Amino acid sequence: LEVRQFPHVVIDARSLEPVTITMPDLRPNMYHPTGDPGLVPTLVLSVYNNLINPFGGSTSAIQVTVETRPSEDFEFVMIRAPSSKTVDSISPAGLLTTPVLTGVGNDNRWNGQIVGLQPVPGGFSTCNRHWNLNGSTYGWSSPR
Amino acid sequence: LEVRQFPHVVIDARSLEPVTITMPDLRPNMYHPTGDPGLVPTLVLSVYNNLINPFGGSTSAIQVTVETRPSEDFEFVMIRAPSSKTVDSISPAGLLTTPVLTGVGNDNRWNGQIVGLQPVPGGFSTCNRHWNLNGSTYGWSSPRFADIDHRRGSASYPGNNATNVLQFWYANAGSAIDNPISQVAPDGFPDMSFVPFNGPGIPAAGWVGFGAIWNSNSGAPNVTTVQAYELGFATGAPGNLQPTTNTSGSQTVAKSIYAVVTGTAQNPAGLFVMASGVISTPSANAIT
Amino acid sequence: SVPGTTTDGMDPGVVATTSVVTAENSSASIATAGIGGPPQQVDQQETWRTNFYYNDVFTWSVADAPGSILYTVQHSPQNNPFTAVLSQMYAGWAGGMQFRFIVAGSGVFGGRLVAAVIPPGIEIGPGLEVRQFPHVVIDARSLEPVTITMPDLRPNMYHPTGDPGLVPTLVLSVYNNLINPFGGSTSAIQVTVETRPSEDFEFVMIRAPSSKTVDSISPAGLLTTPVLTGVGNDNRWNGQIVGLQPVPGGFSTCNRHWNLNGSTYGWSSPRFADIDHRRGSASYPGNNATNVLQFWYANAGSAIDNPISQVAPDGFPDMSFVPFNGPGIPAAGWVGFGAIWNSNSGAPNVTTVQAYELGFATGAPGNLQPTTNTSGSQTVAKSIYAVVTGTAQNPAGLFVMASGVISTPSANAITYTPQPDRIVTTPGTPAAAPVGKNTPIMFASVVRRTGDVNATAGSANGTQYGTGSQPLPVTIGLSLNNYSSALMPGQFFVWQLTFASGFMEIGLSVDGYFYAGTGASTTLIDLTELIDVRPVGPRPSKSTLVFNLG
Amino acid sequence: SVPGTTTDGMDPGVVATTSVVTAENSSASIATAGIGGPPQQVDQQETWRTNFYYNDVFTWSVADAPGSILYTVQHSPQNNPFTAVLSQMYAGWAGGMQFRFIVAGSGVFGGRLVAAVIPPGIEIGPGLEVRQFPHVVIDARSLEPVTITMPDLRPNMYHPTGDPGLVPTLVLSVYNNLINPFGGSTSAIQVTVETRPSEDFEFVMIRAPSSKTVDSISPAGLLTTPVLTGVGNDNRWNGQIVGLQPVPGGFSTCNRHWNLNGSTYGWSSPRFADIDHRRGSASYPGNNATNVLQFWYANAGSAIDNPISQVAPDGFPDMSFVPFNGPGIPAAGWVGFGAIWNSNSGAPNVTTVQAYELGFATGAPGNLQPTTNTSGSQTVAKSIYAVVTGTAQNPAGLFVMASGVISTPSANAITYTPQPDRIVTTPGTPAAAPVGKNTPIMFASVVRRTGDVNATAGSANGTQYGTGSQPLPVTIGLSLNNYSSALMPGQFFVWQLTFASGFMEIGLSVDGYFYAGTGASTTLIDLTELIDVRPVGPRPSKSTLVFNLG
Known part of the structure; x- marks a missing residue:
């Protein structure tokens, strides 16, 4: 995909005022039902010119913050009960909160409070109570 | 699904005049094609308030009847030939008709008249001759009851003397180049595990069909080695016979249940059993 | 300006009139079809009402004499593909139906057609002088299409959907012989009939579609496209129908053969179940019981096994016994794997299973002879390979498999x-006799033999064919429903089977036999390039069905 | 006052709307398509949208029966050349398209052509009856051109160029048999389809030029000019494709054969690198290990290192083994210079480097027979020449080059x-079959031989033509791109190859094979005078491709 020949906007790394693009709702439907919205436009941020740092190493990354606001023609239709839900992953964000690390919560080898995290170069392997993101694990010892 | 938190209409059980409500065509498409309609609204009649009979007794049920009628805005849009995609491709309504379930239609395992419905509360799974709504099977049989015919599966007989000997035949699954669909087993093979049996003991609950053994070099079935052969699946052929469910690593195994004088021991031999x-x-x- | 070379689908062309089409007929038709209620599906701007949709095509060659009938359609709502669908929800119909004829001839051709509406009650066939009716003559050099209206010449108030009654017929016979003034192999043109309901056509009263369905009002859906390609079997062998075998001498089939009256004269249900008989005698010849041939017999008329007829038990083949003795394999006989059970217990005996040829004979204890008639004959079974020992019990039983x-x-x-x-x-079955150039056919199928198990279609040893009179879905649908008010005697119900190269037609008699028009040809039809099967309706019996495979 | 013999580019001729070109359809199409923003390229004075431009010319034979599809096109911007140029410039379209048909026939011809617009939900194939749709009929004697406008019927707001969804399809099939009343060599006329966008056609969004989409790109770019007469090899050996030979009856290659939907049935990814195996037993006949032949064999299923399928190692050649014994070299086969190598970090053996013949055997090491199928077999390899040493270790393997x-x-x-x-x-492969008069072809190459080192295309005896299935640049272009929606199945994507004295057409069906209208001929057609190749588009299987050769 070659974003530089679409109708685009250019965002400098050292810009003060933030750059605004507008995403129209180019759809082959009349609306998008929540749950099966169909074909939607995508918004792609490509690199126009690669990031240069004249200092050298140290800082080699720049955070860019995306902000969002509805346009004039945005609307909702066909009110439903709030008990119906579509996004059921717990995005996988809710499974690790703040008191998990500064309070309750424990390990896969002992029933002991987590107070450290220790990096290991080269890698390691653990599969006893280590579940993957899918609905399976490789081994015995259900987590209890 | 909380029906009462939608825009809703409450209907009393003491209502005398009928109450009608219109379904709007809440669609994302321009129109609904006949074969693939798309996303459509749904209409639900759930209990708002619990039905009470103030007497108490065995007469605790009433009935509601739904009738239907197209609205003033209903239409069909473009005409097409009825010899196009027919009633048997747009909905599976005509697969189960009234003469099918009474005295004409058979089952996909035994080719006998369907005379009942057997509930399976523990659940089951059927692979052979079972088609889904996607028009694809995972089994090894066509949708008919034809013969089982396999080339170059080994045959043998136990012992040395060939008087009242039980005929044995076996061939590994995955090697039967007989079907255009899948080659775990040849066409018409039953999906039944082999219950082992030795000597003059009749096996219990097994698919048994009349069969024979033909030489691969000529195609001629041999004269004397026909019998009622139980057909099935096993795991270990030369030693102890055991039942199996999985096809991967198992082998299609046939063995006659009555005594046959003599019997073929040919390794590229063939097996021919009847359909039912x-x-x-x-x-x-x-x-x- | 619109040139006459291109035609619209709503364009009638030149509206040629006939003296049967009058204003008095139309006014009477509406005023007497009003007993059905208000007219239904009479919106004049509907696309199915205004457009001409395909009915048939037929060939007019230079070898057709004047008076020879090329086209014949009955007045029916099954002519149009859309009034055949709308008649599933209505219990009657009344009114007319236009027919547009497009003659694809050049200006160098000559000769003429003729088009008369025959009143009901008149026999349609050879000897019918079309040119002595009120008629319309159509040139072969005609460029604009010509349309003629069928009036609804009926004695009833309306036509019921199941039993319509007496209807007019429309014939396109040769008025003048087609001439190509050059002479050569290009001596044929084609005329295409399309059809469209008239301004006075209507349906009268509504009814539930879950009433008498499409499988009871006409036998159009008995022969579908997947039936004749790779799904439907035959009524004798339970194998895939892979061909059509013409029988120029004619045949007759009794067992598992249903007519259009929903009745059989044979002794089998419309399925392939086991043969099972109680108290038929069994014996073995000689005294020693080593390598002995098992014999079984029971008199016809005594098998209380069926609710239909008791000449033979269910699934018994209608094949004569070819006699055989010793270690000699019989030729061309129904042989199925069987066994013998004792009647007092029901247990099948251990060793007496074999490939038993099943059939009919006349004299059991002496010399065996073949037979055709069932009255005075006996159902007789005998194994074809050697069986060690064998039952001699007189109340014994026989159990053979289906196929x-x-x-x-x-x-x-x-x-x-x-x-x-x-x-x-x-005794009492009708015979499939040839009617003109049409000949009876039997639906062939690849049936394997005891000389070669691996014999399939295209095998280098040679394919073995087994023929049955009807397809099994056809005789299954014929036993549940009645088509007495769908085909008068002297008529066929014709389907159009189109192939990858040409096309051909088969027709269903009242007696239940199938008829392809091939003359004295006996070559088997391939039936592997069959792509389309569609129905065209009732046609006269003494008309040659078109057959050209290329 | 034009005479009608000369037609302008901007002249539609006679406009024939069937029933689907309605005004409120255009009004409901124009107002809906503003979901893409303002409409683009909407100016009805521009010469690209006021003139009719060539799309595709086709033939109409006297051997075409009624109902045979001659020209079918799905609704697309690719039916017009300038709309197909702007289709890579824009990211969606909406609107109808006028199709203008010019019939090159004199006044002495006869026969008609039906033309219908099929609704988008209708599957088009064998069972489709075109003449039961609203249609128009066009005579072969048409002097003025006939314009049939296909409107944009859609269940979508607009059609994306990546996922158009459901589009209508104009089908122009045979209405009546074309008659030339003359016999002779003349048995076909030509109909040319011009194309012009309608007054409601529009593009919507921009996108980058030739931005790759969800839609499969049409495979007109994978077959170019230098493939036939330059670089480009075959699937089994690395040799130049010098000609084509049509096999009558069909064949089945599934080693390096990729379907148009990107997937393989088989082993051996398309690269002639090497063949390697690690597990397999070696033996030798005779009591003396001197001047013997090495005998390697292993079962089918031991190719653990193969990442596609386990049935064969990478690069194993796909032919049945011809058995031989003694000093006489066998007829044909696949020989390759190789060596044994033992496992467990073992070097290949110095004293045994010989030409080994590869193949699939059954019953090794006893009675070796050819086998048709890869399943239920075993790979084998033995040398044709004499080696003074032999190995008999149970772990052993081969190292043979892939060509x-x-x-x-x-x-x-x-x-x-x-x-x-x-x-x-x-096993389970789809088999190529000759449909119509179109037969499968095969790509031949000059292959060296052991009997004569100088296997040159010249004098001193004729050459040996090793035949491979599809060109390896075409396999390269098909092994990465998925073309499941590039062409609707039942057709083939046809091209136009022009020699120095004639021209012929070949098509590429969904199975990956090539079909040409050579008929029943086994003549080797030589590619020496081939000049240029021009793409055409999709064309159905019943349309006979031309075979005009000098």
Whole structure:
């Protein structure tokens, strides 16, 4: 995909005022039902010119913050009960909160409070109570 | 699904005049094609308030009847030939008709008249001759009852003397180049595990069909080695026979249930069994 | 300006009138079809009402004499593909139906057609002088299409959907002989009929579609496209129908053969179940019981096994017994794997199973002879390979499986085994006789033999064919529903089978036999390039069905 | 006052709307398509949208029966050349398209052509009856052109160029048989389809030029000019494609054969690198290990290192083994220079480097027979020449280069190798069959031989033509791109190859094979005078491709 020949906007790394693009709702439907919205436009941020740092190493990354606001023609239709839900992953964000690390919560080898995290170069392997993101694990010892 | 938190209409059980409500065509498409309509609204009649009979007794049920009628805005849009995609491709309504379930239609395992519905509360799974709504099977049979015919499966007989000997035949699954669909087993092979049996003992609850053994070099079936052969699946052929469910690593295995004078020991030999089958029972009494 | 070379789908062309089409007929038709209520589906701007949709095509060659009828359609709502669908929800119909004829001839051709509306009650066939009716003559050099209206000349108030009654007929016979003034192999043109309901056509009263359905009002859906390609079997062998075998001498089939009156004259249900008989005698010849041939017999008329007829038990083949003795394999016989059970217990005996040829004979204890008639004959079974020992019990029983194979002395294939000279028939069945150039056919199928198990279609040893009179879905649908008010005697119900190269037609008699028009040809039809099967309706019996495979 | 013989580019001729070109359809199409923003390229004075431009010319034979599809096109911007140029410039379209038909026939011809607009939900194939839709009928004697406008019927707001969804399809099939009343060599006329966008056509969004989409790109770019007469090899050996030979009856290659939907049935990814195996037993006949032949064999299923399928190692050649014994070299086969190598970090053995013949055997090491199928078999390899040493270790393997030659004893004229009855098949393969008059073809190459080192295309006896299935640049272009929606199945994507004296057409069906209208001929067609190749588009299987050769 070659974003530089679409109708685009250019965002400098050292810009003060933030750059605004507008995403129209180019759809082959009349609306998008929540749950099966169909074909939607995508918004792609490509690199126009690669990031240069004249200092050298140290800082080699720049955070860019995306902000969002509805346009004039945005609307909702066909009110439903709030008990119906579509996004059921717990995005996988809710499974690790703040008191998990500064309070309750424990390990896969002992029933002991987590107070450290220790990096290991080269890698390691653990599969006893280590579940993957899918609905399976490789081994015995259900987590209890 | 909380029906009462939508825009809703409450209907009393003491209502006398009928109440009608219109379905709007809440669609994302321009129109609904006949074959693939798309996303459509749904209409639900759930209990708002619990039905009470103030007497108490066995007469605690009433009935609601739904009738239907197209609205003032209903239409069909473009005409097409009825010899196009027919009623048997747009909805599976005509697969189960009234003469099918009474006295004409058979089942996909036994080719006998469907005379009942057997509930399976523990659940089951069927692979052979079972088609889904996607028009694809995972089994090894066409949708008919044809013969089982396999080339170059080994045959043998136990012992040395060939008087009243039980014929044995086996071939590994995955090697039967007989079907255009899948090659775990040849066409018409039953999906039944082999219950082992030795000597003059009739096996219990097994697919048994009349069969024979033909030489691969000529195609001629041999004269004397026909019998009622139980057809099935096993795991270990030369040693102890055991039942199996999985096809990967197992082998299609056939063995006659009555005594046959002599028998072929040819390794590229072939097996020919008929389409329908009967039930192997040790006694005359029926079983489950 | 619109040139006459291109035609619109709503364009009638030149509206040629006939004296049967009057204003008095139309006014009477509405004023007397008003007893059905208000007219239904009479919106004049509907696309199915205004457009001409395909009905038929037919060939007019220079070898057709004047007076020879090329086209014949009955007045029906099954002519149009859309009034055939709308008649599923209405219990009657009344009114007319226009027919547009497009003659694809150049200006160098000559000769003329003629188009008369025959009133009901008149026999349609050879000898019908079309040119002495009120008629319309159509040139072969005609460029604009010509349309003529069928009036609804009926004695009833309206036509019920199931039983319409007496309807007019429309014939396109040769007025003047077609001439190509050059002479050569390009001596044929084609005329296409399309159809469209008239301004006075209507349906009268509504009814539930879950009433008498499409499988009871016309036998159009008995022969569908997947039935004749790779799904439907035959009524004799339970194998895939892979061909059409013409029988120029004619045949007759009794068992598992249903007519359009929903009745059979044979002794089998419309399925392939086991043969099971109680108290038929069994014996073995000689005294020693080593390598002995098992014999079984029971008199016809005594098998209390069926709710239909008791000449033979269910699933018994209608094949004459070819006699055989010793270690000699019989030729062209129904042989199926069987056994013998004692009647006092029901237990099948251990060793007496074999490939038993099943059939009919006349004299059991002496010399065996073949037979055709069932009255005075007896159902007789005998194994074809040697069986150690064997039952001699007189109240004994016989159990054979449903399907069968072919008894062949060698591995080489032979002709189709149910020849008409050996088919067991009860007294009283009709015979499939040729009617003009049309000849009866039997639906062939690849049936394997005892000389070669691996014999399939295209095998280098030679294919073995087994023929049955009807397809199994056709005789299954014929036993549940009635088509007495769908085809008068002297008529066929014709389907159009189109192939990858040409096309051909088969027709269903009142007596239940199928008829392809091939003359004295006996070549088997390939039936592997069959792509389309569609119905065209009732046609006269003494009309040659079109047949050109290329 | 134009006479009608001369037509302008901007002249529609006579406009024939069937029933689907309605005004409120255009009003509901124009107002809906503003979901893409303002409409683009909407100016009805521009010469690209006011003139009719060539799309595709086709023939109409006297052998075409009624109902045979001659020209079918799905609704697309690719039916017009300038709309197909702007289709890579824009990211969606909405609107109808006028199709203008010019019939090159004199006044002495006869026969008609039906033309219908099929609704978008209708599957188009064998069972589609075109003449039961609202249609128009066009005579072969049409002097003025006939314009049929296909409107944009859609269940979508607009059609994305990546996922258009459901589009209507204009089908122009045979209405009546074309008659030339003359016989002779003249049996076909030509109809040319011009195309012009309608007054409601529009593009919507921009996108980058030739931005790759969800839609499969049309495979007109994978077959170019230098493939036939320059670079480009075949699937089995690395040799230049010098000609084509049509095999009558069909064949089945599934080693390096990729379907148009990107997937393989079989092993051996398309690269002639090497063949390697690690597990397999080696043996030798005779009591003396001197001047013997090494005998390697292993079962089918031991190719653990193969990342596609386990049935064969990477690069194993797909032919049945021809058995031989003694000093006489066998007829044909695949020989390749190789060596043994032992496992457990073992070097290949110094004293045994010889030409080994590869193949699939059954019953090794006893009675070796050819086998048709890859399943239920075992890979084998034995040398044709004499080696003074032999190994008998149970762990052993091969190291053979991936390109081979054919060993023949006398090599005077021989026979092209491999035969269609010799090629083994990975099981469950779809088989190429000749449909219509179109037969499958095969790409031949000059292959060296062991009998004569100088296998040059010249004098001193004729050459040996090793035959491979599809060109390897085409396999390269098909192994990465998925073309499941590039063409609707039942057709083939046809091109136009022009020689120095004639031209012929070949098509590429969904199975990956090539079909040409050569008929029943086994003549080797030489690619020496080929000049240029021009793409055409999709064309149905019943349309006979031309075979105009000098």
